[PDB]
Design a protein around this ligand. Structure first.
Ligand code: TDK
Ligand code: TDK
Ligand code: MG
Ligand code: MG
Ligand code: NA
Ligand code: NA
Lengths: 595, 576
């Protein structure tokens, strides 16, 4: 066996039987284990490699699950799961029926919070410490937060409250100067100039038998220290966790520590495809994503429109903006993991005559709901939202599935919503949004679409649908990914109409009135919750027109969807092509049988 | 005339004709003018009094509207409106058809941002500075933010980006140690006591300086506004400065009722608000439930928690103006076995949408939301009307939603929520309700409605404020049924099926947008049951509602009792 130490560790109690001098050897086994787990592709390799040493030290010193160790985001906690009885389950992590890619309360007593969205650890830790003190209990509360997650407003504000309440708790700042891209913000720049302190060999331990970046927060500050010296981290944690009041332990780590390729390019290796651990060679993504189609379109658009300015909250790579940031460096802004700041900054740009585009994932746009409503929509400002990862994202699970934007955006006055069927329609909607008054939202899924030639800029009338298949008996209304399912379902069914409902706000009132009055039954399909989304919009509009056709609303049920493939989620939610054919048969359509 | 200087000032151009030695006298005229404007009651007196001197200095030094002066919240900007051509309109501020109580872009070229929610000034200012630099322009950007607004996460994160970008802009920190209550947070504690509190932000820091020395502020502003990079000018002000009563009690005089400026005597609001009913109920409940813990984001007074904070000091938390922190902190409490209650206005709960969804609902945690100012709030206008919570909460899995018809039903819903698994939301309007005896704790079945008036021809479904309209509308109409639809999630599926199948027409009424709210929920449920009755969905239209009385908004939205009777007549009901 390659891992003699790890073979005997089934939980933190087994870990504590090791001597402090054996801990370096254990971190090497953990790093080799994480590399093998991630070699199949699609996992958070570089972040978990960087956090191996602090996670080992935390479980050696603290007594989970009696003590609570909280991970911000949770993508860096693979070593945590390996050390808490889930080593064998790492083979199926993020697979349907397997363990989650992040810490999850229902999965283990050792997982203190369910995370995926960033910056929630500090407020959660405060709540647990206040609950502990209210109950007269005496356990440790520790939170691990990265330098990227620290840029979030809810982390900065929670720290302000944490310093005010002054309760016992430990915050480990896992500082690797990386978010997904290089980290941004003034705090990241300030901490670059902080010198590393040596405590255990013991210069700093002798000095206290030099500035606090959080001095105004009233929090004890220790560091920066070497985040990969596991014995020194143990030594420090033993001497900090029992002190009065809150403490920030600032550690410095190398993202991807232990794998040379990952250390050299921590951006790609944040989430690598299938790779060879011995060579670092990986399977390239030869596909053409919606993200790439958007990036090509907006990079092209900004060449002739000097008012276009793109803002992302820390997702330059995911939203497809790498080339844009290089071609238009003076029209690009990364606000860090602060969706709230991205939207309101764009509002200010629009007030001064710019045409800002907020690139943002559907699940992360949830963080900026009030900024869209209050800061953009009240004055009907020229902010365009290009919303990636719309609908089910799959393996990332319930914390990341963007199945709510058709509901929460639709109830905001003046926010137009479009679903492009292909890259040409995406360009048509982007062109319309950048040349018309008020806010526009354009949402598209994780996945691929065909490339279109440069200079593809069709004119479309916002709010008009397009019929794609003839038929007046039963008509399917769907856009985007749901439309692909609908066209596939009706592929061999003449008389089943299919309408590209490419606009959710406004609806095509004229076409819906005609189709709703002439059809005996309608089917709406959406990659979104059935609650208050596109189907609800159709029912509201039909009711206003006093039309009462039979309507089958297909979408994601009112339940969070666990990690699985999007195809599996959609099959069980009942919106894929076989499920639509089943509904068509229920409505009396002559659907061929399989026997 | 008592205001010889102000009589000649119709804009910042006129203001600059004064000498620097005349500016102290001008601030006195401004303070007296603001006192008279607010003497009719219902306005933001103490905040605008405290900001008189910095606003005068800013308009004396800067060149609005070419330069952009941004106010956070905007409630402190009465002197700004008086100095920018709206002095005469101050008589009708917050009245229907008058000017807004906050700065509003459509109202004046001098109003750089439309505000009401706090902490948006810094991100807005950054966007304007980046837009200016991208266009090659050279005007000043200045933001005025209070110490309370600085506790918001979106202000702290925006400051982190502001320091990163390093663009020309001035941030005036208007520090009076007050929010509505006394301010909270570590920054407030730190600033009470030669160090730059924002050193890690990479921002130039000047102060603290006297926020009421108008000539010194002018002198300082002249030597700061043209410097490279962002600057924080930290000023210290007294909330209510200029009125002895307001300085002595800046909490009440933040928004005083009708008062006599010469005596300080004011009309005591002896009404029993929904806020007071909640405060009484939760203070009572926490005496026998040690797991109850109440969290507010800076609204101890408004949510009715003054007595609670005094009786249960060890079960009370004020997180400042950080709704996001309030909800996720409550989630952590629930994870450790507590029964937290988040007291929050509907409009401010919008700030915590992701925290409700991601941090509370995914693990179905024991957080109870007591949602005040639900529906139209009226005079505060579009930035404050809480008409979206029935829509955005409803699409979150596992979040139950109740609308209590009175204080007894509120206690029944609070009791249920604090003793059952998962998150619960209870929403009630600004306004009054009857007091109930101590020990009123009825048992109710969450999700079941209650019919209040017989009738099968047309049946009205409504809860809360909308139910009051519905009962009044059907007052003399036999055969018009009225159902207390006191639960929006879940709906009473059994009663909706029976009523939807037997009635010729239904009316839904809600103090909420018609888009995706209660009416939408009824239509979705009816469609799932393949029932197709005639339905009239009544609610707030898909348009922001300007400041007016709630009754006026409801009359024009079509949900008050006369409007419902008109719909009943359209449905064939014999209305006299
Ligand atoms: C699987 O998706 P993903 O992109 O890898 C993921 C896990 O979703 C993350 S991880 C991440 C970077 C976090 O940076 P840190 O410095 O905290 O962590 P690290 O350097 O990796 O140890 C961001 C921006 N997001 C995206 C993100 C953005 N905004 C919010 C509110 N939460 C997020 N979590
Ligand atoms: C008319 O309603 P209101 O209560 O007086 C009002 C204007 O709505 C305000 S004003 C306010 C206090 C602001 O404190 P500051 O220190 O910034 O200002 P100041 O001391 O008054 O000069 C709060 C918490 N809220 C409430 C509030 C809470 N949360 C958010 C996000 N925005 C708010 N604006
Ligand atoms: Mg990092
Ligand atoms: Mg203040
Ligand atoms: Na626009
Ligand atoms: Na509960």
């Amino acid at each position: 066996s390659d891992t003699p130490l790890l073979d005997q560790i089934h939980g933190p109690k087994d870990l504590k039987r090791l001597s402090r001098e054996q801990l370096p050897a254990l971190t090497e086994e953990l790093r080799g284990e994480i590399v093998r787990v991630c070699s199949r592709g699609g996992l958070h390799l570089a972040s978990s490699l960087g956090a191996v040493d602090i996670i080992t030290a935390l479980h050696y010193v603290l007594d989970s699950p009696r003590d609570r160790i909280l991970f911000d985001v949770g993508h860096q906690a693979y070593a945590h799961k390996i050390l808490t009885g889930r080593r064998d389950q790492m083979a199926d992590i993020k697979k349907e029926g397997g363990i989650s890619g992040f810490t999850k309360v229902s999965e283990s007593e050792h997982d203190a919070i369910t995370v995926g969205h960033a910056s929630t650890s500090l407020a959660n830790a405060l709540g647990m410490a206040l609950a502990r003190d209210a109950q007269g209990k005496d356990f440790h509360v520790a939170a691990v937060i990265g330098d990227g997650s620290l840029t979030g407003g809810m982390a900065l504000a929670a720290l302000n409250t944490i310093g005010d309440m002054g309760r016992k708790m430990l915050i480990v700042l896992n500082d690797n100067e990386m978010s997904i891209s290089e980290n941004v913000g003034a705090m990241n720049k300030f901490m670059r100039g902080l010198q590393v302190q040596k405590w255990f060999q013991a210069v700093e331990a002798v000095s206290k038998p030099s500035v606090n970046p959080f001095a105004a927060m009233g929090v004890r500050y220790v560091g920066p220290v070497d985040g990969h010296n596991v014995q020194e981290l143990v030594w420090l944690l033993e001497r900090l966790v029992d002190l009065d009041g809150p403490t920030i332990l600032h550690i410095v780590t190398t993202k991807g520590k232990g794998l040379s390729y990952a250390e050299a390019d921590p951006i790609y290796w944040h989430g690598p495809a299938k790779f060879d651990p011995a060579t670092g060679e990986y399977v390239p993504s030869s596909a053409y994503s919606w993200s790439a189609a958007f990036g090509e379109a907006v990079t092209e658009w900004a060449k002739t429109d000097p008012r276009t300015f793109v803002v992302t909250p820390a997702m330059r790579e995911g939203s497809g903006l790498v080339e844009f940031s290089r071609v238009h460096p003076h029209r690009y802004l990364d606000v860090g993991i602060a969706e709230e700041v991205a939207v309101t900054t764009a509002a200010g740009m629009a007030l001064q005559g710019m045409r800002p585009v907020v690139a943002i994932y559907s699940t992360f746009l949830q963080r900026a709901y009030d900024q869209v409503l209050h800061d953009v929509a009240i004055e009907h400002l020229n902010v365009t939202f290009c919303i990636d990862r719309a609908g089910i994202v799959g393996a990332d699970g319930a914390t990341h599935n963007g199945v709510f934007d058709l509901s929460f955006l639709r109830s905001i006055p003046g926010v137009r919503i479009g679903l492009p069927k292909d890259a040409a329609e995406l360009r048509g909607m982007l062109k319309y949004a950048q040349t018309h008054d008020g806010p526009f939202a354009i949402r598209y899924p994780r996945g691929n679409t065909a490339q279109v030639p440069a200079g593809t800029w069709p004119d479309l009338k916002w709010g008009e649908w397009e019929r794609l298949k003839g038929g007046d008996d039963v008509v399917i209304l769907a856009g985007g990914k749901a439309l692909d399912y609908a066209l596939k379902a009706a592929e061999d069914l003449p008389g089943v109409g299919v309408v590209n409902a490419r606009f959710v706000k406004p609806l095509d009132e004229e076409m819906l009135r005609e189709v709703g009055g002439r059809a005996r039954a309608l089917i709406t399909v959406e990659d979104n919750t059935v609650v208050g989304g596109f189907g609800g919009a159709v029912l509201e509009a039909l009711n206003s027109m006093n039309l009462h056709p039979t309507v089958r609303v297909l979408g994601i049920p009112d339940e969070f969807q666990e990690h699985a493939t999007a195809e599996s989620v959609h099959a069980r939610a009942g919106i894929d092509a076989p499920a639509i054919r089943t509904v068509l048969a229920e409505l009396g359509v002559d659907v061929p049988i399989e026997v």
